[PDB]
Design a protein around this nucleic acid. Structure first.
Ligand SMILES: [Mg+2]
Ligand SMILES: [Mg+2]
Ligand SMILES: [Zn+2]
Ligand SMILES: [Zn+2]
Ligand SMILES: [Zn+2]
Ligand SMILES: [Zn+2]
Lengths: 162, 162
DNA sequence: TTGACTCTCTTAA
DNA sequence: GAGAGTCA
DNA sequence: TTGACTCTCTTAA
DNA sequence: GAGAGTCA
């Protein structure tokens, strides 16, 4: 809600609830042929999810609290960042999973960045493979690799140069 | 159905027409602090665009030919790949700009790959900066770099571990 | 047969 | 990656 | 007040 | 990154 105190209270209530979610160990590629371990705090697959939480999409949740007798609601992963600017360079800030695990609500696995920065982590070589993200990746992106391109650049005649 | 010969004729007429688009020289990052040159064949900003071409969106065009009284229409960048498989690993193939310039229709700047592979090129370090794409990038992706993350992983209490 | 517009759709963050 | 409404 | 559902939206390839 | 309709 409006006051800093009320916002800190929301963050603290959220952390306490999420902190009771099951802690799931995930072994992940780091890049450079190395492997690490992340501890995700995973929201349950079905109701009940936890105090204040409700599912609005297959992998979308929202946190809600009643403050000043009014319901205040936020995307489940946005709560840690309620005191941060909500935009950067005119682009909306998004919650962004460093563990690439939607159900995870561990704030140590979240950052707050443009959707472009968010998406780009999917292809990052990872913290031991050359990640250059200023807020460093926790793992190699799940889509990192050579790809599966079906056909490369080509011409039939002689009209084009690279 | 169109025969192979008819498809080749469509590809040839498309190449003939695109080869008369203005050829624009662009200096581009290759990765590793190196600069290179790409020559894009750019569709005009407004009509007329060229024989067979029409704009269906701000940065979307289609190529249309009438063959034996039947109107055939394709996405304007898909024509080079009409003799290729249209899916791979259960995913639809997309035209993918290696020059990241939608107006460009240079087939030497296009490949044919999943939308995920396509998007991921936006963040690639480039052919001189560590590109691992099997069909190599022509340039560093426009979104490569440290990013502009507003807030990193953080907790107010001690409920979490990474 | 052709040009120049119009509309909505897909994907996965 | 989001916001908001309908019920009980 | 709290929970458990429903719906559509945003972005940029 | 796509497909398809209207009109002259
Ligand atoms: Mg993400
Ligand atoms: Mg692309
Ligand atoms: Zn996690
Ligand atoms: Zn990274
Ligand atoms: Zn080009
Ligand atoms: Zn590449």
């Amino acid at each position: 809600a409006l006051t800093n105190a009320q916002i800190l209270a929301v963050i603290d209530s959220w952390e306490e609830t999420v902190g009771q979610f099951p802690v799931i160990t995930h072994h992940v590629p780091l890049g450079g042929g190395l492997q690490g371990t992340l501890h995700c705090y995973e929201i349950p697959l079905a109701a009940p999810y936890g105090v204040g939480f409700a599912k609005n999409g297959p992998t979308r949740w929202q946190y809600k609290r009643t403050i000043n007798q009014v319901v205040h609601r936020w995307g489940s992963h946005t709560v840690p960042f309620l005191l941060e600017p909500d935009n950067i360079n005119g682009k909306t800030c998004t919650a962004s999973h460093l563990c690439h695990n939607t159900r995870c609500h561990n704030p140590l696995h979240l950052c707050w960045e443009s959707l472009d920065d968010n998406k780009g982590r999917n292809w990052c070589p990872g913290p031991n493979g050359g990640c250059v993200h200023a807020v460093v990746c926790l793992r190699q992106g799940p889509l990192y690799g050579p790809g599966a391109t079906v056909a490369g650049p080509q011409q039939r005649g002689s009209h084009f140069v690279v």
